[PDB]
Structures are given as C-alpha cells and as structure tokens.
C-alpha cells in the first residue's frame, strides 16, 4: 500500500499537544535540551505512542470522579479512561492517552453532571502538571478550582483545558516548559514507556515543528507549543498503515498554484520531520501550501537547504 | 478515485456540532423537527455546506475584538474569520464558520493576549444564541461574563467553548434545543444559505444520528447532540472529493473480528445516513466496530432491516 500524507493546508490542521489549531511552521534548534513529547507520536506505519490518541478534542482532557480536599478549594480527581472505563496503571503506556505532556498551569473548566437528576455545574479550574499531586499514572491528579462545596462524589467530572497561566510578579515566560515532561507518577517514581527523544542526525539538519501559540489565561505564560505531527497525520497514519520501505520519506512543500517546490523535508519513520537549516525560523509558507510525498530515501539524503 | 469512509470506530470520533468526542449511535422518527444542522454539512464528494469548517476545535468557537457594556458585566464581540481575517457579512453562508446551530447558552472562556509584553486573560463568559444580541452573521455577539474592567479592545479575543447551562425554568431539559436553529442575524433578518433540511424520503426509514453528551455547567440542560456526520468524515470527504457515482453510498457496519455485518445503513450524497428501522433505538455495537462503503446503489434500493 502506498505511503500518502495528508493534502490539508497548515491552517487548516490541529496541534497534536493542545486543542488548538496549527499556526506556523517553525524550525529551531535543539541540542540544548531533549525534544521528548508523548502526545503526537505516532510512526508512519501507524503505530500510536507515549500518551498519543486520536481524537484532537480529547487530548489535555481529563475525566473521573472528584473528592473534595477538606478546608481547601483543591479537589483529586481519580481518574478513568477517555470512554470513562477503568483505567488501568498497569498498562505499558506513561500516563492516560491525552494526559498533558508538559510541566506547566493549564486552566481549563471542570464540569459534572449527577446520574440521578441529571443536574449539572461547571467550575474554573487549574491542573499544575509539576506538583507533587500530578500522578496520572498511578491514577490520580489534583485540580485547584474556584469552589469548595460544589462536586459531588461518586458523579463524571470532565476537565477541558482553555489555557496557560504564569505567576506574573515572577520572571516572564519562565512557565510552560513544554520539553520538560511531568513526572507522571510523582515525585517518588520514574516515567515510564516513554515514546523517544528525537533529534537530527544529518549534518546541517534541524527538527522542523509545527507550531501554535496556546491562549494565556493570566499572567505572561510562555505560550509556545510545538508538536512533532499535526493530529491529522496521526489519524491518518493510523488508519493508512502503509509499510515503510525505507526510514526516510521525502517530503516536498508545493505552492499549487505556481506548482513549485518551496522547500524538502525527511519525515522519519518513527514519527518527526527533519529539515536543512541552523537557528530559530519560522518558515515563510503561501498559505495554500501542502506538503507531497515523493520518495523513500535512505538516511543518508542530502536535502536542499530551507 | 474510489470513495471510502474513515476506519475509526465510533468512539474515536468527534461531534462536528460541538468538539467532544461522539458516544453512541441512535435513531429515532424525526418528523417533530426540522433537522438541518448547519455544522457537520458537507457532501461526500467533498463540498462544505452551511457553517461547516474542518477544524474540529474551532466548532462553537468564536475570534474577534471586544468592547464592553458599560454598566454591565457584558461584552459584545465584533467577530473575524477563524485565522482572524476579515468576517465578510455578504458572504454567501449563514453565518460565520463554526457558529453553534442551536439555540441555548454555551459556557466557556474568553482569552487574550498583548502581543507588546505577552500578558494574558481569561475570564467566564456565556453566550446566549437565543438573545437578540446573537447577530453572528451581522458580525457581533453578546458575552455575559464575570468581569466588567479586564478586556482590551481593538486585540484579538477568542471564546473557547465548554458546556451547555440551563436557566431562567423551572422545566428541566427544555434547553438547549438542538433542532432548532438561531436566528443568525436576529431580528433583522431570517436565516440564508442554510444547507438543508434532512428527512428520510423512503418507506420505513430513519435517520441514523452520531450522538454525543455535552458538558453541562448548571441547571438541568439538555445535553443530547445529535449530528449527521462525525467531523472525520467530513475532514476525510474534504481531502479525498472522491466523485459520487449515485446518489446513494451503501455502508456496512462490520465487526473487524469477526467479519460478522452487524446492520447496512445508506449514506446520501448530500452528506446524511439513513436506515431501516421504525422506533426511538440506542444501537448496540460491538467497541471495534466500523463502517465500510461497499457499494454505490440506484434509487430503488430497500435496506435490510436493522
């Protein structure tokens, strides 16, 4: 079967980090740091990893039963599958599927609805992905809203996330981080069945990411979020499952109306794009662009520079 | 170029009429109502209809500039397109892409950013698409909200759609009605453009819904969602503009474990799915269950019993 990407246009697809729309191609570099995130990690032969799923509006998303922490607004969330079955820690994955991949304050809403009645509430909420009370792993998080008497036990809560928040009397931008991982089981264990670091190998290769800018809810959060593959590609490798002949698919970035080439890439097998740049660019794209596959090549393909 | 349809199961798709993941098949009569959606529209060679866009996070979404009701705790917003382009009121759509389609009170946030210093907000807000200040195609909304002094105007404002509340009776469930349409430009002119109204047209068919659960944040709401196409296929008819051979695409639902065909069900090529069956009926479907197209058939095609 052969190996296609998908024909959508940058805007018109879907971070596979947050529920947001993609914004921008953008390439920087990455030797400072490890480039590690478990939602959006999927090989082109169609296999899902880290955290990754495939619905876009699930991902940051989570769904239990609440208890409220006494004398506090602080409620634990326990947590189930994204179908509301059990959740299972014992399964070879980090975290839940759509469980946040970054340290970082995301604000959101928590909603329940009562079986019996069908009454419902709706509250602010914040899920600090670096407390110690973050353990989605073992099956638990913590949430800070703005009650302390208004969720029941026993009832479906949901979290949908909205935004970031930064501590604004605090050095600006100095929170999200979005390549620092939570410590899914806390601070007394040790992530687990992460998908990998990636990096270029190539010389004069850089990752190339596709990039959104996450609504701020307060303060001056750092908003940046790149995703390795837009959600549309994970949800179209995972269906397509064609072989890969070779670890490298060539990529080419057409302006269909003038029909010509702006740019090559190498999308890899296990799941990340690589392009021929050095230092921090966001690419300069006619907005009706797609990216065409063309060849399997071998790792060692000499793209032409961006 | 041979027409298919998406391999995701049910469950790993999304309502095209609010971004929450589908739950269920149903169907049920449907002559109490006019049925005609205005997301989650499209053909299935590919043509977009009504308000219907392809991102499934932009559905409820609204983006624009805020300015403030002095005395209140309100805030009309004078709308843009979803990648902040000028909204065009002489468009020939009903309203701008991705607007609710049904009448009731959506909670969510509104957000914003300035671009000098990276400083952010958010706050509570419920749009009412019953009021009279819900004008979207005359290019404005009204916001009720818990603040009266945080926005800036003339910057880029976006309202992140969460749940459904229910207010103002004593009845419950009597809100959202998800039959009926807003009137998009209130009082100052009916509804255009719309795509249309759906009935089965053949003996002893129904419709078949993709239905979902919305979040509700207070009162008692009605939170069936019922639409007429997941927002995947609509994404994958889009991209693929497969030409329709008839008028009518015959999909079997098939368990892939078994190969056993649990019911057969036509999808129109206006972008709609009957079957065959007389009453209100939760269908019960195994959790890897799929539809496959098989065959374009003629209009004097009788479906097998469900």
Chains 1, 2 share one sequence.
Not at 208 to 218: Q, V
Request: aromatic residues 10%.
């Amino acid at each position: 079967k052969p190996f296609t990407v998908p024909i959508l246009t940058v805007e018109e697809m879907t971070n596979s980090r947050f529920p947001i729309p993609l914004e921008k191609l953008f390439t920087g570099p990455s030797g400072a740091f490890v480039v590690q995130p478990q939602n959006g990690r999927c090989t082109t032969d169609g296999v899902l990893l880290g955290t990754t799923q495939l619905s876009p509006v699930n991902i940051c998303t989570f769904r239990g039963d609440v208890t409220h922490i006494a004398g506090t607004q602080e409620y634990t969330m326990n947590l189930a599958s994204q179908n509301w079955n059990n959740y299972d820690p014992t399964e070879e994955i980090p975290a839940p599927l759509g469980t946040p991949d970054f340290v970082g304050k995301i604000q959101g809403v928590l909603t329940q609805t009562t079986r019996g009645d069908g009454s419902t509430r709706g509250h602010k909420a914040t899920v600090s992905t670096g407390s110690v009370h973050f353990t989605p792993k073992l099956g638990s998080v913590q949430f800070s809203t703005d009650t302390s008497n208004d969720f029941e036990t026993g009832q479906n809560t949901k979290f949908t996330p909205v935004g970031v928040v930064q501590d604004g009397s605090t050095t600006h931008q100095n929170e999200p981080q979005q390549w620092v991982l939570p410590d899914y089981s806390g601070r007394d264990s040790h992530n687990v069945h992460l998908a990998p670091a990636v990096a270029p190998t190539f010389p004069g290769e850089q990752l190339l990411f596709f990039r959104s800018t996450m609504p701020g809810c307060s303060g001056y959060p750092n908003m940046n979020l790149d995703c390795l593959l837009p959600q549309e590609w994970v949800q179209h490798f995972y269906q397509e499952a064609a072989p890969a002949q070779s670890d490298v698919a060539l990529l080419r970035f057409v302006n269909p109306d003038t029909g010509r080439v702006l740019f090559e890439c190498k999308l890899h097998k296990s799941g990340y794009v690589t392009v021929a740049h050095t230092g921090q660019h966001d690419l300069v794209i006619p907005p009706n662009g797609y990216f065409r596959f063309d060849s399997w090549v071998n790792q060692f393909y000499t793209l032409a520079p961006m």
